[PDB]
TrEMBL record, chains B, D:
It comes from the Bacteria. The keyword Transcription does not apply. It comes from Acinetobacter baumannii. SUPFAM superfamilies: NAD(P)-binding Rossmann-fold domains (SSF51735). It catalyses: a (3R)-hydroxyacyl-[ACP] + NADP(+) = a 3-oxoacyl-[ACP] + NADPH + H(+). Belongs to the short-chain dehydrogenases/reductases (SDR) family. The gene is fabG. This is 3-oxoacyl-[acyl-carrier-protein] reductase. Homotetramer.
Amino acid sequence: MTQERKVALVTGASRGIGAAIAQQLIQDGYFVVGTATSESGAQKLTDSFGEQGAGLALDVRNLDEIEAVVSHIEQNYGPVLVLVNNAGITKDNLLLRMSEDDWDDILNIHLKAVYRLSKRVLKGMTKARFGRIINISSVVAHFANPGQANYSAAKAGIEAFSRSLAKEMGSRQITVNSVAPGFIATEMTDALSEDIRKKMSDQVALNRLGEPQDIANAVSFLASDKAGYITGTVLHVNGGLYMA
Amino acid sequence: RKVALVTGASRGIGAAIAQQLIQDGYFVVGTATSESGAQKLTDSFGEQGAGLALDVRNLDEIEAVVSHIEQNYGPVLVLVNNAGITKDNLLLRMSEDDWDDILNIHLKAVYRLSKRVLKGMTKARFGRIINISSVVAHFANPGQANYSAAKAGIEAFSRSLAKEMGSRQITVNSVAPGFIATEMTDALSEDIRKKMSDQVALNRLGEPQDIANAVSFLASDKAGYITGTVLHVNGGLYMA
Amino acid sequence: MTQERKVALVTGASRGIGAAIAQQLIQDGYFVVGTATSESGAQKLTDSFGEQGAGLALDVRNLDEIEAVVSHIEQNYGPVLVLVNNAGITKDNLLLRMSEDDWDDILNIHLKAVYRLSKRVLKGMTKARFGRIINISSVVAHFANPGQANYSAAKAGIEAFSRSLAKEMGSRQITVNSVAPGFIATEMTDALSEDIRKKMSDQVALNRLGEPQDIANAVSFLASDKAGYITGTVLHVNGGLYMA
Amino acid sequence: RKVALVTGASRGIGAAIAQQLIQDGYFVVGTATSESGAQKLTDSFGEQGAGLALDVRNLDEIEAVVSHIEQNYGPVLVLVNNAGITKDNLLLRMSEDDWDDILNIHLKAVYRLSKRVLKGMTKARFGRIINISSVVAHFANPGQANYSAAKAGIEAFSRSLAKEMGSRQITVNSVAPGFIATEMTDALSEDIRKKMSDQVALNRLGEPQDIANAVSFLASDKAGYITGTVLHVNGGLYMA
């Protein structure tokens, strides 16, 4: 039992974008720790990653669990040198119907979790004089959508936090970036109808929904030496749905 | 007169906003966190306003204050969310309390107050929600991750709400001040604020009245086709 | 014959947005020189402005005419202390069908004209330690539209030029800003059908087309002392059609 | 192999781009304005490329070069518009020639070359147009109004063209370098580029290979769902 590869931590790795990111980072040569909210899901991740990764249960809303998970990774696999913040649900509602819990839960799962996990991995990245924090944002952080004020506020806050952290950590060669997916094919889009997914792809310049692997490719690029002079940016992967 | 609610109106930007909105013809309820401050606000606004105590961190107080305003003065049709509290620290030294308090005072308060005033604005088919953001939401500053995240969240929240409320002719906008002359800015002496003003194209720190002018514009009929935007008032410190 | 009011120059003042801007600046207390491309149009402007303005013919594509017009204003009315660059047409075409003239004419009418006129009025603004350059951009400089690559490139170039000039002239208290109209009711939108203008207003958060006076209000604000700490910005007046 | 055309490939950013695209598997035609430079490009690329002389200001030369490439090597399916010529001056001192030459070398050339390669990309239902912009298109620099306007125009042009060509699976993107180590940057000595690198979060000037890496990414299958964007490569000098 000796683990010599650099360690990547991917939260919310069970399916879709998170699963593709985790598998791509494995292919890139990392030892990947993926997280799921349940222990069953964590075991499914352990099974998928085999001897080049591990699955751990983590509710990113809880600081005690964040600290325990990162401590476990450091004590068993090594310092987290790539952090991909992908965990996170939506709780949509127009503001008149958006409850205190609807707001707080989303802000905690997305923005607070990014703050907590980034803070927790900073010591190891600083010691290594190498680090990658890659936050999965969304196109709705830029192109606002009614009913997603909580999600949009959280994602935009994550982007601003990333800029501040990039400035604080730049001299230690830690890059902090966000990837903003557009319409990507997920179980959720699979749930939608043919006609709705044509409505969606009609809004995309490339005239199709993206795939999880497109986001994985963007993250793999940002985590590599090929993006060592890129920090504090948003990398939009939306097929021209939103251009900035 | 139409009722405007301005939080944190005791001094600086908030006070200038309240006085300007009074001049524009609104009945201005300004808030302070202390009852002493609320009484001084009552005294300053006189017959064209009222002062109320409000800790914007507390939902019960928000609901009570808005209910009181509705019961005595009228529907809140202009809401200006003005908070300027900082708890700076580099992330290594930024505690959970430092993060949470800033997020609550700024972003959560914007959520709570905006939600609470929606009914009256919807009924009137008229509304102005004006959120005080900051240049730091765009031009990042080391040690202000919490403040930057909160202000950027406020801007994104404003865009979403603007889409939700637009058809009722309610506009939701943010004003982003740059370096404005204040208590703490006055505390540093000549070379330090020369360091600051050297970054400003207009080569000077702004004044609270500049932000009040932007808020007055957005709250007026002159800006009825402007919604979901950020109005930068920073002398060229940061340029779209 | 003595002219004591501050002089504003509004190019393309014959109708719609330009006409509303010119009339509002008159109401604000300026002596307004408006331009039209023909001498007939210039005479119609002279008639509309009466004793508080003048109409002059100007093809903004031509440097000799720019220099002659500004010299005439300085010699008869006073230094141009407010410049509103509004002259400018569209020549739409998908790139495969966009000719050299289609490109050059639009770039010259919009971007080159802004460069030439701003350069020409800088001396007077510098001497006065007061100045307002206000450029009418467009929402399509931000939300790109197929078939308008020339117009979009010109408007975005104008915005970048404005940022550079704002930095160069800031210490002399000259502000340089752009106003970006969205769907505003013009003869061109009047030409469109009821159903198309509902398609358009359906995209606007405020659920209606704007009016020239909305743009005039934005320009009047920027030209006043109420916006003396605003420079190098874009003021979007699009009813929520585009949010940034 | 697929044919990529890289303008201004003789040195620095352009040379790094050309070499990297060769490594990625493209047949790279690089251009220089002199025939001497074109021959040196031919020598450097050897069996995996060709060097051609091109003054990007001249439409006839653009059409001749692209026709030659089509007649000998194949359809241009990757176009990298790389120009880095400056003619700085504050507006008071910026002549008509200084403005026009920069606009022509940068923006007009992007228009002309992009237009000329559209037919082959459309036929192949594959394409990469990658335009070298600059941080100055976003963070304004006194004395560079012409360069800033041209680069920003290039970015807007790219967005419009991306919408026009997207359904044919042609992506159009810009790469915006920050402070990259070059001839002229090397000319200034330690304290001057320390002044520069102090503005960079990563606390150093970039290298041509960083821009080549970004262009290689965008030109690859790894970026097939990225279009109409600006990829900032500036070490945190300017942050979206």
